[PDB]
RNA sequence: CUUGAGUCUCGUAGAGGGGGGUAGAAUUCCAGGUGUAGCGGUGAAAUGCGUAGAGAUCUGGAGGAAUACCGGUGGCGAAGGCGGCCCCCUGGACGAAGACUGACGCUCAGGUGCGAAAGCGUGGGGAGCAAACAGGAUUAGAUACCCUGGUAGUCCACGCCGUAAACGAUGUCGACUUGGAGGUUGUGCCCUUGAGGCGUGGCUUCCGGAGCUAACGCGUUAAGUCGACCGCCUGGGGAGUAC
């Protein structure tokens, strides 16, 4: 994506952090 | 302490193919990890240690 | 004058002229106030992976405290040379004692 | 950049004594030594914009120290900027 | 004929098709059979039920050469990866090693910006 | 005058820039060998590629473009942005003690300079990818989604453009004001025995009463309590449009 993957890896840190 | 040719104490910080093992599998304090990564990358370059298992 | 801890590699099947590399490089670097402070030759070895023909190669170190201007012309001497394979000049890394 | 002895001589002759780094003329001439060195860099690259920010920062601080010389003590100002050729 | 008795089996497990080629270490592909070309066509009828068809025909296609213990390496993901291993092993062969060596890149090129729906 | 601001001694970290090389995987192409009737493609399909030797395989060779793993709620930068490795030049930042100037400061209309991506100009380059354009399905129709090709562009140097949901939708600077848990980078003392304990810095992410808010929420990195400057707002459309 060149701009999503830094967003999902900085969103799903809402998914898979706790 | 660390350098790029202590090749003995690096096969404990890579896998069989040479993919650097992450920190969250070893826990080496985010600095020794960087230095290890550079050592490992310039050891793959210089061919002491393989890029990939087919490399 | 900054510390430069370098590493060479030459085709393994002419280690006869490795002393030629010595008598060239060490002389040319000592000419400029250089000193080969901790030199060690691991000699004939086995790579992690092949290089252009053969799985073997020939490791030597030089590991100088050279001035910066002469080591780059050394690298130029590598660049067109055939008997060498890969160099890796480094930087002082906050110059430390013998490694291995 | 600039070396330790290169700054040491500037602190030496331009300071009222040894270790007078702080007097504004020492700072001015040390900054102008560095600027004169870096013109030779920036004439080589011309696409290094993340260093002309630093060059401009120190040219701006040099002008800001010079104006302070001008108000506080004129004689040192008019004796320095010809020892440097400064304030063209 | 030559009867090398061993060989490196190839499973180019693509997604729409999983063709398999049998060979020894020199890279001399002597026999091969195509899952999606084993009479079968389409996509869901070229799925690994066809892969075992290709495996059995290839076993028939090279049973004249007498290859007993078999090395296999795979390319690509896909359903035509697992069932074919069991099929070829049960089809008069003996295994040597299984792997899928599908070439992950080091960020080299651009593959397409395909379906979006 | 020394507390504001700045110089020097000294180290610490870093995808901060600019210029050079350099490696290997991966797509593609080309040459070679083996041998073979399909390959690809999707919700089924043809266009396509191919019986010549395609796909598949290994052997090499050319080129261009990006740097798997580490990698992170990480780091750096004024922002835009910056990830292989090594060197050359360079820019900041921070921390330990010191020394030195003596208010040298903050903000800044105009002004100057940097400004993602597209786009333009003149010459190269061009592997993939691909607006446009072709051909095949879809649909009621399809100029779209979908597939097969595919040019500009994407890459490089020089020049221009100046815009973005350029966003923390939070201007810069300073002072004050309960706590907790992390992160990253210095450092002081302690048997560092060590990992650290006791402290101290900086940057940083997440909770949370005071307080503030319409509210969500912010909450020592404030949207709290104040100060100095600057920019902007004044119902929706018309309109960021005409001139």
Curated annotation (Swiss-Prot), chain C:
Sites of N6-acetyllysine modification: 93
Keywords: Acetylation, Ribonucleoprotein, Ribosomal protein, RNA-binding, rRNA-binding
UniProt keyword Cell membrane, yes or no: no
Gene Ontology CC: cytoplasm; cytosol; cytosolic small ribosomal subunit
Example of a GO MF term: small ribosomal subunit rRNA binding
PTM description: 5 different forms of the protein, varying only in the number of C-terminal glutamate residues, were isolated. The sequence shown is form bS6-6, which is the longest. The first two Glu are encoded by the rpsF gene, the other Glu are added post-translationally by the RimK enzyme.
Domain of life, per lineage: Bacteria
GO terms, biological process: cytoplasmic translation
Assembly and interaction partners: Part of the 30S ribosomal subunit. Interacts weakly with uL2 in one of the 3.5 A resolved structures.
Family assignment from sequence similarity: Belongs to the bacterial ribosomal protein bS6 family.
Biological role: Binds together with bS18 to 16S ribosomal RNA.
Protein name as annotated: Small ribosomal subunit protein bS6
Residues shown, of full length: 1 to 100 of 135
